Amino acid sequence: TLLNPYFGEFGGMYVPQILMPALNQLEEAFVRAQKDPEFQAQFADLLKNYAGRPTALTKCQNITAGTRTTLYLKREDLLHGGAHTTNQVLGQALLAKRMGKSEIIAETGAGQHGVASALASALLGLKCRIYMGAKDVERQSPNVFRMRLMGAEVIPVHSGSATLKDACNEALRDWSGSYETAHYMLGTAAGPHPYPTIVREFQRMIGEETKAQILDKEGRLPDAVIACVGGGSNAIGMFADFINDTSVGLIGVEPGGHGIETGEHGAPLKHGRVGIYFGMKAPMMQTADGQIEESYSISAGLDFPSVGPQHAYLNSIGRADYVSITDDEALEAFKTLCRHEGIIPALESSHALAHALKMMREQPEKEQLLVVNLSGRGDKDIFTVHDIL
Amino acid sequence: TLLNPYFGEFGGMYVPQILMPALNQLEEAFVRAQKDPEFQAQFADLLKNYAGRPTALTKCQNITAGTRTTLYLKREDLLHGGAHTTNQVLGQALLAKRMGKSEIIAETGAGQHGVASALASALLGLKCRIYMGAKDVERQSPNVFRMRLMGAEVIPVHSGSATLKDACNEALRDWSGSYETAHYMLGTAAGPHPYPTIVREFQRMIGEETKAQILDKEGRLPDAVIACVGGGSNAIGMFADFINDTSVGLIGVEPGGHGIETGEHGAPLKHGRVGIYFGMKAPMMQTADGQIEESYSISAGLDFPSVGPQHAYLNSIGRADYVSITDDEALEAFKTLCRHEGIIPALESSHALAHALKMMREQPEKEQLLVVNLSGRGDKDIFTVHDIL
Amino acid sequence: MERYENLFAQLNDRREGAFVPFVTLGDPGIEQSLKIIDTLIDAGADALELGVPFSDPLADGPTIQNANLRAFAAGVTPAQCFEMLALIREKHPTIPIGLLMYANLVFNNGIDAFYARCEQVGVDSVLVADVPVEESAPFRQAALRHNIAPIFICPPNADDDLLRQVASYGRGYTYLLSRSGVTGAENHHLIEKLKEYHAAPALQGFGISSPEQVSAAVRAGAAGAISGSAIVKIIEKNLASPKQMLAELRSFVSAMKAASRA
Amino acid sequence: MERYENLFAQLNDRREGAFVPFVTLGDPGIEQSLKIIDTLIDAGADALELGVPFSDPLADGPTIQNANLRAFAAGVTPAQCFEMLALIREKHPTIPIGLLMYANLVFNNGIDAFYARCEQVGVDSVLVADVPVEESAPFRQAALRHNIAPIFICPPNADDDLLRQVASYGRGYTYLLSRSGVTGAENHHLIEKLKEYHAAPALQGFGISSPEQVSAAVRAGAAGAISGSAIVKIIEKNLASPKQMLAELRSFVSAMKAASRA
Ligand SMILES: Cc1ncc(COP(=O)(O)O)c(CN[C@@H](CO)C(=O)O)c1O
Ligand SMILES: Cc1ncc(COP(=O)(O)O)c(CN[C@@H](CO)C(=O)O)c1O
Ligand SMILES: O=P(O)(O)OC[C@@H](O)CO
Ligand SMILES: O=P(O)(O)OC[C@@H](O)CO
Ligand code: NA
Ligand code: NA
Numbered sequence A, B: 001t002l003l004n005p006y007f008g009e010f011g012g013m014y015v016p017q018i019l020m021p022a023l024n025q026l027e028e029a030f031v032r033a034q035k036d037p038e039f040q041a042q043f044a045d046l047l048k049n050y051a052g053r054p055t056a057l058t059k060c061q062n063i064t065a066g067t068r069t070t071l072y073l074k075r076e077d078l079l080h081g082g083a084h085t086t087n088q089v090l091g092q093a094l095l096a097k098r099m100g101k102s103e104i105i106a107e108t109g110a111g112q113h114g115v116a117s118a119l120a121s122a123l124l125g126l127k128c129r130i131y132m133g134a135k136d137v138e139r140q141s142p143n144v145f146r147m148r149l150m151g152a153e154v155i156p157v158h159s160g161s162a163t164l165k166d167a168c169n170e171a172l173r174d175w176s177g178s179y180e181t182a183h184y185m186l187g188t189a190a191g192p193h194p195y196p197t198i199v200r201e202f203q204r205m206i207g208e209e210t211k212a213q214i215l216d217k218e219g220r221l222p223d224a225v226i227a228c229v230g231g232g233s234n235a236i237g238m239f240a241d242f243i244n245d246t247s248v249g250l251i252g253v254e255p256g257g258h259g260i261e262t263g264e265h266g267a268p269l270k271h272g273r274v275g276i277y278f279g280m281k282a283p284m285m286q287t288a289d290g291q292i293e294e295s296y297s298i299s300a301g302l303d304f305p306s307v308g309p310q311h312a313y314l315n316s317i318g319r320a321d322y323v324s325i326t327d328d329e330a331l332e333a334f335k336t337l338c339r340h341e342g343i344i345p346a347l348e349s350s351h352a353l354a355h356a357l358k359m360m361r362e363q364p365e366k367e368q369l370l371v372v373n374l375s376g377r378g379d380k381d382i383f384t385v386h387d388i389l
Numbered sequence C, D: 001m002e003r004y005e006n007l008f009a010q011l012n013d014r015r016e017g018a019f020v021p022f023v024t025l026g027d028p029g030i031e032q033s034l035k036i037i038d039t040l041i042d043a044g045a046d047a048l049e050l051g052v053p054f055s056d057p058l059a060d061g062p063t064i065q066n067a068n069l070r071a072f073a074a075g076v077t078p079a080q081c082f083e084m085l086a087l088i089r090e091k092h093p094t095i096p097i098g099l100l101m102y103a104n105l106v107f108n109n110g111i112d113a114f115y116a117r118c119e120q121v122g123v124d125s126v127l128v129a130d131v132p133v134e135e136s137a138p139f140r141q142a143a144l145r146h147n148i149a150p151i152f153i154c155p156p157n158a159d160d161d162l163l164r165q166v167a168s169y170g171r172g173y174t175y176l177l178s179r180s181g182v183t184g185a186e187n188h189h190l191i192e193k194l195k196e197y198h199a200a201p202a203l204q205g206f207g208i209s210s211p212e213q214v215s216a217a218v219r220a221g222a223a224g225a226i227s228g229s230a231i232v233k234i235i236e237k238n239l240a241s242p243k244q245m246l247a248e249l250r251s252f253v254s255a256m257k258a259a260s261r262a
Helices: A017-035 A037-052 A086-098 A112-124 A134-139 A141-149 A164-178 A195-201 A205-217 A233-242 A309-316 A327-341 A347-362 A379-385 B017-035 B037-052 B086-098 B112-124 B134-139 B141-149 B164-178 B195-201 B205-217 B233-242 B309-316 B327-341 B347-362 B379-385 C002-013 C030-043 C062-073 C078-089 C103-108 C111-121 C137-144 C160-169 C189-197 C211-220 C229-237 C242-258 D002-013 D030-043 D062-073 D078-089 D103-108 D111-121 D137-144 D160-169 D189-197 D211-220 D229-237 D242-258
Strands: A010-014 A057-059 A069-075 A103-108 A127-133 A153-157 A182-185 A224-228 A249-255 A273-277 A279-284 A321-325 A368-374 B010-014 B057-059 B069-075 B103-108 B127-133 B153-157 B182-185 B224-228 B249-255 B273-277 B279-284 B321-325 B368-374 C018-024 C048-051 C097-101 C125-128 C174-176 C202-204 C224-227 D018-024 D048-051 D097-101 D125-128 D174-176 D202-204 D224-227
Touching: A010 A273, A010 A309, A017 A037, A017 A086, A017 A164, A017 A195, A037 A086, A037 B057, A057 A205, A057 B037, A069 A205, A069 A347, A086 A112, A086 A182, A086 A195, A103 A112, A103 A164, A112 A127, A112 A141, A112 B327, A127 A134, A127 A164, A134 A141, A134 A153, A141 A153, A141 A379, A141 B327, A141 B379, A153 A164, A164 A182, A195 A233, A195 A309, A205 A233, A205 A368, A224 A233, A224 A347, A233 A249, A233 A309, A233 A368, A249 A347, A273 D103, A279 A309, A309 A321, A321 A327, A321 A347, A327 A347, A327 A379, A327 B112, A327 B141, A347 A368, A347 A379, A379 B141, B010 B273, B010 B309, B017 B037, B017 B086, B017 B164, B017 B195, B037 B086, B057 B205, B069 B205, B069 B347, B086 B112, B086 B182, B086 B195, B103 B112, B103 B164, B112 B127, B112 B141, B127 B134, B127 B164, B134 B141, B134 B153, B141 B153, B141 B379, B153 B164, B164 B182, B195 B233, B195 B309, B205 B233, B205 B368, B224 B233, B224 B347, B233 B249, B233 B309, B233 B368, B249 B347, B273 C103, B279 B309, B309 B321, B321 B327, B321 B347, B327 B347, B327 B379, B347 B368, B347 B379, C002 C018, C018 C030, C018 C062, C018 C229, C018 C242, C030 C048, C030 C078, C030 C242, C048 C062, C062 C229, C078 C097, C078 C111, C097 C103, C103 C111, C103 C125, C111 C125, C111 C137, C125 C137, C160 C189, C174 C189, C189 C202, C211 C224, C211 C242, C224 C229, C229 C242, D002 D018, D018 D030, D018 D062, D018 D229, D018 D242, D030 D048, D030 D078, D030 D242, D048 D062, D062 D229, D078 D097, D078 D111, D097 D103, D103 D111, D103 D125, D111 D125, D111 D137, D125 D137, D160 D189, D174 D189, D189 D202, D211 D224, D211 D242, D224 D229, D229 D242
Parallel strands: A069 A368, A103 A127, A103 A182, A127 A153, A224 A249, A224 A368, A249 A321, B069 B368, B103 B127, B103 B182, B127 B153, B224 B249, B224 B368, B249 B321, C018 C048, C018 C224, C048 C097, C097 C125, C174 C202, C202 C224, D018 D048, D018 D224, D048 D097, D097 D125, D174 D202, D202 D224
Antiparallel strands: A010 A279, A057 A069, A273 A279, B010 B279, B057 B069, B273 B279
């Protein structure tokens, strides 16, 4: 392979033999594209002029009142589509086309990668199938209608928990069968190499822009950057340019679900053990017998029982710290961003936010410059958060 | 007054005597603010760092195929809140605060000004009441829940057609009673002076940015800028910097509803006669006896039987041309933007778009550089457009 | 124009304040509207404030808004209003009748053409609810040429130059406001200054429903009180027993007018 | 390791192709699973491919997925699988049994610890469905140390170096794929090259349900055919009449095995 598939012991290519040349085709395509100035140039043009980038870095006026915490947000919620998701998908559709492919299979949990997969397929002209679990189809339906109006097909996975795991499964089952015509647009920095490296590289603008922005506004780098972690893409997009500046801590937030202690959560990296599933060796939530476990979160984009490998590695060597946030703590940070800052965040991004509030209000006299990645908008969520009354 | 309230015969201050000093307070406040460098500076900071501006100018790749038309869109749909609406409201909340006011009354039809009025009141700390017609509350409900979660109150006007006219009415009825504490955040460049001038000045960045952008991409100014017209704000925000460049035509699109000929439409400026209502002398839709008429459109933000005065004037001297688009023609341009460009537009902005397609496909060999103001996203609309099956 | 001077001279004369009822022309049907108007004159009405039903009542609370809808359902147009205005002038030639209007209905047929139809029918004053003093010039020049008194509102927040302008351009009476808001049946330096400027008789306006407010007003210096919603509420209330309606109306007016001794 | 060499020598000997059934261990309950396995051996089975039920069957179509759920509802764990594997080795000591696995279940208890339990119970080969050749080293070194044949898949899109690696590391038989996809009951240069490289006997895999595919395969150069879903579908179909199930199964196997003469 031209690039390393392991982040310490984590990573790998744990696929059916039949998909291996395909993964190998992709890694070559990626290495070619990254040096191709003509690829770089039009990835850029569509990021700027179509997706709407640079995204802004907003200072919080009201939630930090009577605390020595300054809190900026990175506004990926203002990105065409409504989430960080769109930056990666544009690079990957361009890779699909460079490789003469013409269908796109993708899987979705919050519906945001589905929607972003439909918008880029319609723009660049590719046909598109999307698997989505039957429970996420209900609790995330705004994103369903949005996909079908753009002409994508979404297919309801009823097996298992009927959630992202179950969509990943049907998505890989179809790509093994279709890999000739179809590229598989993977949702996160998870699964088989080269996907952990591609999703990160196609999302590192998030942190390259924050570093530049904070330095212009504050003349110094943050004390900590915080991001929520379901599979790992927004977090690694954010962490990536910061990793060699040892002064900047990096915190990642996993779903605490109904509370770790209930079993009902989605916190692999800190409360699961290494396993092998979905093409990788990464922390996982499993029974004593190695049967993969069903996770839980109030938020569909975070309801996933494994975590991408580079997060597993940055945890292990102690360069990033991972924490969890309950359903209730994420609802509290949603209600507070709405009412005191006039931004509805996605329930996914609220887990990252709710940790930053906890950091602030537990030590109010601590002087600390924080940055939270506001990865998406809460438009998909407003019907659900409002039946919690 | 320090500024002129008439655009040729159109305009004026046709209010109850009791609100006049209030309108006079506001015009003074506006003139002070516009010269106050400290006002300008923080209007800017919140436009850039909070709303997310400059908005992008996107070239259409696929809808112009086999035509000599180049079509750019101005992406006000990528503005915090989801519509052009947010630029004006930030300036006006700042004016409300400069004048020691603390409540905000506003009226809404598409829900987008309501939502933008709630987000700025929550950010700048002002209490906020919103009137919205009972039919728009149903056909635009995503925007309702969004308002209430940000802590605003929306009040359902059931009188009349239960649409924006009826909300404007209850909104002015309450402000006459509350003008001491409360500012009235008017929805558009319509009603009593100084509001036609304030809304335009607080929306002209739209066109100042397009002029700059097109000149950088094309080295020449457009052949035409197109925008839809319900009350008039996005259109005048777009037209304003272009008015002295006689080479640039300006087209404005009114709801043709079920077809002009059915009576069921919202096209005052081209199919109504001058009247006096809502604080102005402007074209209006009325019976033979001067009773104001109920309009119709598939889109709630365009369902309004009068038009702001400066549009009435630019029409009259022949510097801007106004046209209409049927419900069906706007649904066709929605379906086409989704599926070939991967952008869901608001049904309001689709009327402007559907005219540009008509311009293109009627004369396919005509070499023409067009610009459409994509004023909002279609998220409020997806449930409704999808029961039209 | 003159019927007012008449009334104010004979009222000043027999030392009492004026009592002006309000009703929307045509509510709850033309036939019963005309009888309500005769019973109002019968029971004690010094002059009359009448409304022509508008679609969008910008300065009106709900009683009047529903009154308008009752009228509209009875099929009342601006033309039926003028034809019933001449039938009640034909039998009560003394009483000042003032029309309370909205600008679109004045402006519709040509502003000057409106004033002429008023003159023709026997109308004394026109109050246009939504044209401020600074916009009045077309309306006040055309009513003067057709000898209709231009009525202007004096608001609680009026200043130096405004009381001066209202005093100069006004005629008939100065409509003096009680409160901010829109017409609803619920809840001195200005009167002095108006008289200093020689503004015609201050009649007090929004929200009188109680006789003691009338007495109070007159006592304060107001040449009378105007009551509107209070009366319409009895039309609404008794729509089912017309007899009892006319009967309760009568009672209400005489009491209200009794209160005018000062 | 050896039971395969045995079978392939005696089959080459009496000039016929091999017939390997597939069943998921424990479907539709342990008791009937063991009887299905005896009837399969009874009717014609040359060797056995067996599945240990996994939660997430990455390379399996629906018949096998539901089979897994039937097993799971019957309460079958990896431990009940090993304890039933030793009971059927205890009464059929000749037959090669191969286990078809997913990597998490091998890896769970320690990879080497897995291979040892296999050895202990009487298992001949382990096919790990999701570990490609380039990831096999931990798995192939630990099965060699416990004398279990490492089985590898040869895909229709295999190249030069891959057929070389599969030939070097493989043992038992080379699992030769019929098509792309996941296990479902529906729809030469490689065999030559594999033999040139000295890769153990190519058994053909996905989607055989028809006897003529068996004959065809053997005729093509494949040392036998593997059939899976086809068989499980009769377990599913006849869950209500166990008698008729065992009876229809028998019939199916003998026919399928009859087709192996070439
Ligand atoms: C706004 C937002 N932010 C974050 C995430 C979590 O994923 P991340 O861990 O990859 O960064 C999601 C999930 N997005 C995926 C997975 O469910 C999708 O298919 O919709 C999201 O919707
Ligand atoms: C996206 C979008 N674009 C355009 C308009 C039409 O108004 P404009 O004529 O003022 O520019 C609307 C209306 N907005 C108003 C009026 O109904 C609101 O209260 O929601 C809109 O929602
Ligand atoms: O405020 P009201 O209720 O007395 O009604 C006002 C009308 O008479 C009209 O001047
Ligand atoms: O493709 P099938 O249906 O024959 O089933 C494949 C399994 O036997 C396992 O190798
Ligand atoms: Na996860
Ligand atoms: Na309009």
